[PDB]
Scaffold this active site. Structure first.
Site, PDB file in Angstrom:
ATOM      1  N   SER A  83       0.756  -1.250   0.000  1.00 42.91           N
ATOM      2  CA  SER A  83       0.000   0.000   0.000  1.00 42.91           C
ATOM      3  C   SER A  83       0.787   1.301   0.000  1.00 42.91           C
ATOM      4  O   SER A  83       0.485   2.212  -0.782  1.00 42.91           O
ATOM      5  CB  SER A  83      -0.989   0.004   1.165  1.00 42.91           C
ATOM      6  N   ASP A  94       1.192   0.035   9.060  1.00 44.81           N
ATOM      7  CA  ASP A  94       2.641   0.102   8.988  1.00 44.81           C
ATOM      8  C   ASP A  94       3.113   0.380   7.565  1.00 44.81           C
ATOM      9  O   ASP A  94       2.317   0.620   6.658  1.00 44.81           O
ATOM     10  CB  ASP A  94       3.274  -1.211   9.484  1.00 44.81           C
ATOM     11  N   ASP A  96       5.477  -1.474   4.848  1.00 47.67           N
ATOM     12  CA  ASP A  96       6.146  -2.725   4.536  1.00 47.67           C
ATOM     13  C   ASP A  96       7.349  -2.461   3.658  1.00 47.67           C
ATOM     14  O   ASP A  96       7.274  -1.685   2.700  1.00 47.67           O
ATOM     15  CB  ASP A  96       5.187  -3.686   3.841  1.00 47.67           C
ATOM     16  N   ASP A 148       7.735  -2.918   9.031  1.00 49.03           N
ATOM     17  CA  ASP A 148       7.976  -4.352   8.899  1.00 49.03           C
ATOM     18  C   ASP A 148       9.128  -4.489   7.912  1.00 49.03           C
ATOM     19  O   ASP A 148       9.084  -3.910   6.828  1.00 49.03           O
ATOM     20  CB  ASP A 148       6.752  -5.044   8.306  1.00 49.03           C
ATOM     21  N   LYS A 209     -11.036   1.187  -2.054  1.00 44.24           N
ATOM     22  CA  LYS A 209     -10.670   0.657  -0.741  1.00 44.24           C
ATOM     23  C   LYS A 209     -11.552   1.208   0.361  1.00 44.24           C
ATOM     24  O   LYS A 209     -11.944   0.475   1.272  1.00 44.24           O
ATOM     25  CB  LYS A 209      -9.198   0.944  -0.419  1.00 44.24           C
ATOM     26  N   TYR A 218     -14.086  -5.749   3.487  1.00 45.39           N
ATOM     27  CA  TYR A 218     -12.649  -5.545   3.379  1.00 45.39           C
ATOM     28  C   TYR A 218     -11.909  -6.367   4.427  1.00 45.39           C
ATOM     29  O   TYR A 218     -11.809  -5.966   5.583  1.00 45.39           O
ATOM     30  CB  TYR A 218     -12.319  -4.064   3.569  1.00 45.39           C
TER      31      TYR A 218
HETATM   32  N1  LIG Z   1       5.131  -8.995   7.961  1.00 49.16           N
HETATM   33  C1  LIG Z   1       4.675  -9.481   6.818  1.00 49.16           C
HETATM   34  N2  LIG Z   1       4.962 -10.759   6.465  1.00 49.16           N
HETATM   35  C2  LIG Z   1       4.495 -11.245   5.305  1.00 49.16           C
HETATM   36  N3  LIG Z   1       3.736 -10.615   4.384  1.00 49.16           N
HETATM   37  C3  LIG Z   1       3.464  -9.315   4.773  1.00 49.16           C
HETATM   38  C4  LIG Z   1       3.881  -8.687   5.934  1.00 49.16           C
HETATM   39  N4  LIG Z   1       3.424  -7.385   5.998  1.00 49.16           N
HETATM   40  C5  LIG Z   1       2.753  -7.266   4.891  1.00 49.16           C
HETATM   41  N5  LIG Z   1       2.729  -8.396   4.096  1.00 49.16           N
HETATM   42  C6  LIG Z   1       2.062  -8.615   2.785  1.00 49.16           C
HETATM   43  O1  LIG Z   1       2.430  -7.573   1.902  1.00 49.16           O
HETATM   44  C7  LIG Z   1       1.346  -7.272   0.989  1.00 49.16           C
HETATM   45  C8  LIG Z   1       1.213  -5.760   0.907  1.00 49.16           C
HETATM   46  O2  LIG Z   1       1.135  -5.147   2.220  1.00 49.16           O
HETATM   47  P1  LIG Z   1       0.050  -4.074   2.606  1.00 49.16           P
HETATM   48  O3  LIG Z   1       0.174  -2.945   1.685  1.00 49.16           O
HETATM   49  O4  LIG Z   1       0.079  -3.796   4.075  1.00 49.16           O
HETATM   50  O5  LIG Z   1      -1.262  -4.953   2.176  1.00 49.16           O
HETATM   51  P2  LIG Z   1      -2.858  -4.956   2.118  1.00 49.16           P
HETATM   52  O6  LIG Z   1      -2.748  -5.225   0.701  1.00 49.16           O
HETATM   53  O7  LIG Z   1      -2.613  -5.846   3.301  1.00 49.16           O
HETATM   54  O8  LIG Z   1      -2.706  -3.366   2.476  1.00 49.16           O
HETATM   55  P3  LIG Z   1      -3.729  -2.456   3.321  1.00 49.16           P
HETATM   56  O9  LIG Z   1      -3.013  -2.071   4.534  1.00 49.16           O
HETATM   57  O10 LIG Z   1      -4.851  -3.360   3.518  1.00 49.16           O
HETATM   58  O11 LIG Z   1      -4.065  -1.247   2.503  1.00 49.16           O
HETATM   59  C9  LIG Z   1       0.109  -8.007   1.499  1.00 49.16           C
HETATM   60  C10 LIG Z   1       0.547  -8.442   2.864  1.00 49.16           C
HETATM   61  O12 LIG Z   1      -0.046  -9.654   3.290  1.00 49.16           O
HETATM   62 MN   LIG Z   2       3.454  -5.663   7.626  1.00 46.29          MN
HETATM   63 MN   LIG Z   3       1.249  -3.219   5.948  1.00 45.35          MN
END
Ligand SMILES: Nc1ncnc2c1ncn2[C@@H]1O[C@H](COP(=O)(O)OP(=O)(O)OP(=O)(O)O)C[C@H]1O
Ligand SMILES: [Mn+2]
Ligand SMILES: [Mn+2]
Ligand SMILES: [Mn+2]
Length: 463
Positions: A83, A94, A96, A148, A209, A218
């Protein structure tokens, strides 16, 4: 752009420009747009991190005594994905990021030397490693921002600044832990290069979203869609109307999916065969993939179905939500309604004639947090038991849970539609207690209980 020719090449009219601007404006109040100051602050934090990564890798490089023609040119870079990378970061969520390091740096180094470096940084608080998870990760709050960090060790002497992680040759021979840690970036980067206009895509995603959230659909965990999944639906929509702007794109989004012929898969590009022995979604060769109800495939290899958790209940719910979205946008386009109507939340606690209330308690806030996380991952089980019940048509789990000595209790509300239930819910609670205990993740006095209720008597069990 897509795997098919677009449906229409028409560009917007001035009428649509104004409609697009109004959409932008009804969104601000919802905090959909991150504040510029914050965006600048996140940017400066990432920079610091990236420098910490380069520092660290440099240091490791020296301790391994590599030459200076290399030590000086060895790279190291942090890549943001998901995101925040798409430009639609959810305020409160957070950031990522993937730490990409050259060959001579082991994962053990990540969780040791790099970890210790972050440990001694003024801005770092709440440093916690989870190197034994599906995707090893180091979590931490950096100057108030939640981050993360995944690690990936590529087979390169140096990490060139322009490295493009989409290159499938980068995964060859890598450890699965390394491969999984790369997926996020690759998926995100694919998506960005798979849409005709990033900006128009961005604004549309923002709208969609919010819409899904306000409409209780969602959640990847609970059988609906997550951010990546919503991003792929919007992208496919963009590929189809390449010159349209958000205004008509949001509307086209609904036209296109309210009428999608499931389980025909949503694909952003043509899949390519790559030995690698990695799991690939493909009903032609995997009979088990033929049972997926609403497949939305990630574009990077190994392509996977990002929504295999969808069940008859959730798909049905979402199909109906799409149809209503189409209807609302139709009148918004005719000026018989304002954008605010799209993001109006239907009283979930009033659209169904029957509900199931799920209660989760714990003796302490820490446990309520853990416990709730466990039970949430178990709810699909109940939904499954319910679907297999002649009398029930679908179960709609409102993904937004909420607060019920010093009580530490949370609760979910599940909508039901009929074509008594005590045995199924009792069965569910026993399974939750059993699995949570068998997996050594149960604490004394952590409780979970469910009770069927009629719409009319839900009032007494809410505020
Ligand atoms: N700590 C983690 N370990 C493994 N996969 C992760 C972790 N943090 C995020 N991800 C994966 O990265 C992808 C993109 O992250 P993110 O942008 O937070 O997703 P969403 O697609 O979950 O976003 P939203 O926060 O819902 O807008 C989907 C998520 O499952
Ligand atoms: Mn994360
Ligand atoms: Mn995230
Ligand atoms: Mn997320």
């Amino acid at each position: 752009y897509g795997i098919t020719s677009p449906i229409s090449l028409a560009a917007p009219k001035e009428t649509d420009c104004l409609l697009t601007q109004k959409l932008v404006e009804t969104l601000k109040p919802f905090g959909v747009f991150e504040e510029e100051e914050e965006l600048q602050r996140r940017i400066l934090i990432l920079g610091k991190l990236n420098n910490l990564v380069k520092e660290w890798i440099r240091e490791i490089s020296e301790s391994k005594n590599l030459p200076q023609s290399v030590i000086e040119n060895v790279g190291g870079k942090i890549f943001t994905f998901g995101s925040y990378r798409l430009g639609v970061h959810t305020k409160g969520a957070d950031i990522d990021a993937l730490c990409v390091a050259p060959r001579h740096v082991d994962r053990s180094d990540f969780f040791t030397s790099f970890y210790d470096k972050l440990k001694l940084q003024e801005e770092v608080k709440d440093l916690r490693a989870v190197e034994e998870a599906f995707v090893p990760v180091i979590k931490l709050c950096f100057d108030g921002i939640e981050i993360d960090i995944l690690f990936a060790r590529l087979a390169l002497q140096t990490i060139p600044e322009d490295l493009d992680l989409r290159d499938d040759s980068l995964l060859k021979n890598l450890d699965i832990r390394c491969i999984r840690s790369l997926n996020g970036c690759r998926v995100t980067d694919e998506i960005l290069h798979l849409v005709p206009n990033i900006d128009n895509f961005r604004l549309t995603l923002r709208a969609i979203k919010l819409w899904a959230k306000r409409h209780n659909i969602y959640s990847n965990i609970l059988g609906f869609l997550g951010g990546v999944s919503w991003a792929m639906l919007v992208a496919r929509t963009c590929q189809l109307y390449p010159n349209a702007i958000a205004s008509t794109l949001v509307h086209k989004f609904f036209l296109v999916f309210s009428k999608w012929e499931w389980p025909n898969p949503v694909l952003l590009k043509q899949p390519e065969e790559c030995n690698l022995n990695l799991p690939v979604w493909d009903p032609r060769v995997n009979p088990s993939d033929r049972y997926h109800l609403m497949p939305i495939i990630t574009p990077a290899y190994p392509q996977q179905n990002s929504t295999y958790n969808v069940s008859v209940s959730t798909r049905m719910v979402m199909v109906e939500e799409f149809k209503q979205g189409l209807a609302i946008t139709d009148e918004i386009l005719l000026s018989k309604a304002e954008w605010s109507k799209l993001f109006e939340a239907p009283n979930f606690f009033q659209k169904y004639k029957h509900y199931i209330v799920l209660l989760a308690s714990a003796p302490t806030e820490k446990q309520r947090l853990e416990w709730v996380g466990l039970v949430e991952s178990k709810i699909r089980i109940l939904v499954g038991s319910l679907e297999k019940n002649e009398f029930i048509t679908l179960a709609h789990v409102n993904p937004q849970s909420f607060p019920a000595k010093e009580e530490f209790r949370t609760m979910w509300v599940i909508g039901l539609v009929f074509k008594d239930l005590t045995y199924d819910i009792q069965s569910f609670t026993d399974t939750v207690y059993r699995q949570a205990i068998n997996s050594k993740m149960f604490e004394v006095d952590m409780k979970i209980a469910a009770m069927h209720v009629k719409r009319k008597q839900l009032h007494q069990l809410l505020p």
